[PDB]
Design a protein around this motif. Structure first.
Motif, short mmCIF file in Angstrom:
data_model
loop_
_atom_site.label_atom_id
_atom_site.label_comp_id
_atom_site.label_asym_id
_atom_site.label_seq_id
_atom_site.Cartn_x
_atom_site.Cartn_y
_atom_site.Cartn_z
N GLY A 227 -6.90 -8.81 0.08
CA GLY A 227 -7.17 -7.52 0.04
C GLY A 227 -8.49 -7.28 -0.58
N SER A 228 -8.75 -6.03 -0.73
CA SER A 228 -9.91 -5.17 -0.98
C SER A 228 -10.63 -5.83 -2.41
CB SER A 228 -10.13 -3.64 -1.08
OG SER A 228 -10.38 -3.10 0.00
N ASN A 229 -9.71 -6.23 -3.21
CA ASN A 229 -9.70 -7.30 -4.31
C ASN A 229 -8.42 -7.43 -5.05
OD1 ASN A 229 -11.36 -9.23 -6.35
ND2 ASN A 229 -9.98 -8.17 -7.43
N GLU A 230 -7.92 -6.29 -5.28
CA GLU A 230 -6.88 -6.57 -6.52
C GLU A 230 -6.37 -7.52 -7.11
OE1 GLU A 230 -3.93 -3.08 -4.35
OE2 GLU A 230 -5.64 -2.56 -5.98
N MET B 129 -12.42 -13.28 5.37
CA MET B 129 -13.49 -12.19 5.03
C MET B 129 -14.67 -12.93 4.24
SD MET B 129 -13.32 -9.44 6.44
CE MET B 129 -12.02 -8.62 7.70
N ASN B 130 -14.24 -13.90 3.58
CA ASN B 130 -15.30 -14.77 3.04
C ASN B 130 -14.41 -16.14 2.28
OD1 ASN B 130 -15.10 -14.25 -0.43
ND2 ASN B 130 -15.82 -12.17 0.65
N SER C 266 -9.09 -13.87 -3.64
CA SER C 266 -8.43 -13.10 -3.82
C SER C 266 -7.92 -12.13 -2.55
CB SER C 266 -9.65 -11.82 -4.58
OG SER C 266 -10.86 -12.20 -4.55
N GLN D 150 0.72 -1.18 -0.02
CA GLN D 150 0.15 -0.05 0.05
C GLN D 150 0.90 1.32 0.02
OE1 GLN D 150 -1.48 -1.74 4.47
NE2 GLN D 150 -2.88 -1.31 2.44
N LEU E 264 -3.06 -10.86 5.91
CA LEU E 264 -3.84 -10.34 4.46
C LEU E 264 -5.06 -11.16 4.35
CD1 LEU E 264 -2.24 -12.61 2.61
CD2 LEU E 264 -0.47 -10.95 2.40
N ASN E 265 -6.30 -10.54 4.13
CA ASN E 265 -7.58 -10.88 4.69
C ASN E 265 -8.32 -11.90 3.74
OD1 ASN E 265 -7.33 -8.75 2.57
ND2 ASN E 265 -8.89 -7.53 3.42
N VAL E 266 -8.23 -13.21 4.11
CA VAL E 266 -8.99 -14.31 3.25
C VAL E 266 -10.04 -14.79 3.92
CG1 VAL E 266 -8.34 -15.70 1.37
CG2 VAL E 266 -6.40 -14.87 2.54
#
Lengths: 544, 544
Positions: free
Chosen positions: A305-308, A227-228, A303, A154, A223-225
């Motif tokens: 992060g937020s998505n990228e 999340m779903n 994916s 980031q 790093l955020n997986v």
């Protein structure tokens, strides 16, 4: 720990080197933000010339003046700070160049040494080597790694945002693109190589048998997986195919193995940070079958992060032997043994040696032995020899002789031993089988001497008291123990009776069997019978 | 706090109701997992019929038997459990139906009462009302909300995964799709309505002036947006356009306002969880101009979670008055005042009243007054009347008379007051202006009586000692204070000198100006001059 409490620093350096790059980034962005309103203050006191058209006499000639003078100073600051802005920008890009280099070091050490090692620790656990240990220590490592890499991500992404909002014809587009080029290489590394099998599938499984695996992703925490939670899909694949899967020329679909009844959702345990996926009930369907290696492939996609960034992780199971049988757990269990022991690091899926130096087979044998019979009474110096003699069919009577010898797979479990219609492994297997089947206590107990030939039995006893005996692993017969004893009117075929196998031992136990025989007086070294077996004799509500 | 420590429960209910729905979900998924290997155990002992073809005499007739019998029992369990599986499935769907209902309640209370209220607290802060307070108390609320809604999301998403992996013709596809239908309505609510302006832009700004705003997103902490911080884009938009933006018929591009020098990246403060975005240096360009309302629109876009859901948040600034001028901060500052005070809840962007009941103008006036002159010496009961008399141009001498009266905007700042060529606001403005400009201390100090007409000045003094005086806000003149005193050979035009404005008070201060005049002996109520001004006289290295 020393080499570990070394990476705990290499981390907190990374922390602070990372923790100052956005300290530059931030002010280097105050700079931009200000410089921009100057660029503009300039344009302001400029279109002020086009507007002096409301013009008295002397005073709006003589404010062309204060205006031109306020530009001469501005355009000077502006030119002067432009290079300040370019320089700082470069400073910070080569500062990342720097933090990354150190991070690529840590990453490498973590992933290629630490994980590879915990991985082999597991592999060798296959042959009953010592347990891998908890993944927890590496996860901390990896999320710490993911945390510090993803910041720096980031960070330069903000740098983009700055340069892509105030262009600056310079060496910076490169450094940025090169620096952004390596940070993506370092993530795919991280993500892929941290998608690992925690609990490994049964190495020798039979068609339709409920088995399990637990696969986890170490970075899934940070790093955020979670999340779903993604689906991880199990699919059994041939050795031949694992080769094709690696040098990516698939038809990502085929699977010389066919379906298996399970393919499940990942699940985060908050306050451990462990993103597990337990497959607690899978099932199988569909120059020998007994030497056929298959591997359970675990694939998942998702994916970060937020998505990228979006990845597809893959992970291969240690090799597996599928048996549609009555049971030859035995033959398979060898081709597995040999694979677990001797696998080269990074062998193209299932590249095993063909020959191996005796003392390495020795430590494989020993390891599996102890694990199996559940004693730490291993194959002693002598034992290893009795074997070496049996296996090699040579007389050489002390170990260090064999150090340089070499055993083919085929001399381990293809060629049948000289006397017999079984292989070396067959024998050694049948030993561990009857031992762990009935005589586990009797082993560390010491009662069964075991690794001795008719002759050694003969020598060790001849001059002993009347009734002295031992228990010897019968090459005599397919997986048994003969009792050799000595009573005084004996022979050169001195007192030993024909082997007992698992059969005999079920229908009636050895300890009991030994306790009924009067001539059997004490168990080799000197110690009397009752002593070494009375624990294990069977009672009733019986008598004197 | 009582009504707040009420939502702290409504939360921990939601916590536990949510904490048991995945306790069902989990076992209801052990069920499925097991039931599935039964469906299969059945198919197993079934294709066992097609394979009895290796068939002795009596025994493989008489194992058709044990086979058919093992099915009769299986198919029974299987039928019996299917309805177990359907029922639990429904139980858990209507259990979500339930948790959501309570969550829609909390959400509603939080968003529509709590936030709306902190929002108005802010809006009224515009007219110098008491400070909003820290957002922190609501964020906790919102992330706690986002946390417990987002679970329930992944929860039913697991329920999908189950039903979409073992179909069950039933009422479940609906309940699931209905339950999944509401949980998306509850998020767009959450996300959009929590993208809010923390620090509001200057309500009256002039072309090219550095101003700032701070916008934050309360949920940004929990459901994971920090992961790659979005850009928030500022854009100035007309009242007319804000109307079009709401009832979504844009051409999402136009902006009767034109560019402004700033549009920045959001930024997470770890360990506060606050996803801010500070615009610390923006800039403007491009039946009156002074009554023209514009609003600064803040828009941002981004995806929540691993990716699936993606939003575009919008948020409108309190209204703003752009002035390309010398300065009429004054006229604008009124149309802002009237906007902040009287805005109806949910008025279609800038729907203001036209008339207003006096006592409500009173508390607006008072609020701004105190804020501006920085004293909590407010407009007293009497003061309010002096005004009411001035504004209404009627004699009525005590307040409660006006309770039912009504002031049009035009009677506030369109129609000039009867005597004069200024409006009511012009007057009241110039009072606050000179006061906060030079005489701030003198106000709570008590020195300037102020809200009195020539007549009241005349009465309050006539029978007082010689030199008794007061300070009175001069309708006399555009923003000043006349000194009325009394010496004994006076008149019905009794001693008062012509007004002093800001000019006079710069060139020389009131306290000084009062201290030079000998006839001015003590300040109204009784108290002697030196007493109430000697603090504020100017010295030198001077004399006796």
């Amino acid at each position: 720990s020393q080499k570990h409490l070394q990476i705990n620093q290499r981390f907190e350096e990374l922390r602070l080197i990372t923790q100052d790059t956005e300290n530059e980034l931030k002010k280097l962005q105050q700079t931009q933000e200000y410089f921009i309103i100057q660029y503009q203050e300039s344009l302001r006191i400029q279109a002020q010339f086009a507007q002096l058209g409301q013009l008295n006499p002397q005073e709006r000639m003589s404010r062309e003046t204060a205006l031109q003078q306020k530009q001469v100073s501005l355009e000077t600051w502006l030119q002067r700070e432009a290079q300040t802005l370019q320089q700082y920008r470069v400073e910070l890009a080569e500062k990342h160049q720097k933090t990354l280099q150190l991070l690529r070091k840590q990453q490498t050490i973590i992933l290629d040494d630490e994980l590879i090692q915990w991985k082999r620790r597991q592999q060798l656990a296959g042959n009953g080597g010592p347990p891998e240990g908890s993944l927890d220590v590496l996860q901390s490592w990896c999320e710490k790694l993911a945390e510090i890499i993803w910041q720096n991500r980031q960070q330069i992404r903000r740098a983009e945002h700055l340069c892509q909002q105030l262009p600056i014809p310079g060496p910076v587009e490169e450094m940025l693109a090169e620096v952004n080029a390596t940070i993506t290489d370092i993530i795919s590394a991280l993500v892929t190589s941290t998608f690992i099998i925690e609990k490994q599938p049964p190495q020798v499984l039979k068609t339709q048998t409920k088995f399990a695996a637990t696969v986890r992703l170490l970075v899934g925490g940070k790093l955020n997986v979670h999340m779903n939670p993604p689906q991880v899909k199990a699919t059994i694949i041939s050795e031949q195919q694992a080769k094709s899967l690696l040098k990516n020329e698939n038809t990502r679909n085929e699977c010389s193995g066919e379906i298996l009844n399970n393919c499940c959702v990942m699940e985060y345990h908050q306050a451990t940070g462990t993103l597990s996926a337990h497959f607690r009930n899978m099932s199988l369907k569909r120059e020998s079958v007994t030497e056929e290696k298959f591997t359970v492939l675990f694939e998942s996609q998702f994916s970060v992060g937020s998505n990228e960034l979006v990845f597809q992780v893959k992970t291969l199971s240690l090799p597996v032997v599928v048996i549609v049988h009555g049971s030859q757990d035995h033959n398979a269990t060898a081709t597995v043994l040999w694979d677990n022991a001797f696998a080269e690091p990074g062998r193209v899926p299932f590249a095993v040696p063909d020959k191996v130096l005796w003392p390495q087979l020795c430590e494989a044998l020993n390891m599996k032995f102890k694990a199996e019979v559940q004693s730490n009474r291993g194959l002693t110096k002598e034992n290893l020899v009795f074997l070496a003699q049996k296996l090699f069919n040579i007389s050489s009577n002390h170990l260090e002789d064999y150090n340089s010898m070499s055993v083919s797979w085929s001399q381990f479990n293809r060629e049948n031993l000289p006397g017999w219609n079984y292989t070396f492994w067959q024998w050694f297997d049948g030993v561990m089988e009857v031992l762990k089947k009935h005589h586990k206590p009797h082993w560390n107990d010491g009662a069964i001497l075991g690794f001795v030939n008719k002759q050694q039995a003969h020598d060790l006893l001849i001059n002993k008291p009347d009734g002295t005996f031992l228990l010897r692993f019968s090459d005599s017969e397919i997986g048994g123990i003969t009792i050799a004893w000595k009573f005084d009117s004996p022979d050169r075929n001195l007192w030993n009776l024909k082997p007992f196998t698992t059969r005999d031992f079920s229908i009636r136990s050895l300890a009991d069997r030994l306790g009924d025989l009067n001539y059997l007086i004490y168990v080799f070294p000197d110690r009397p019978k009752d002593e070494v077996f009375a624990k294990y004799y069977t009672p009733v509500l019986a008598k004197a």
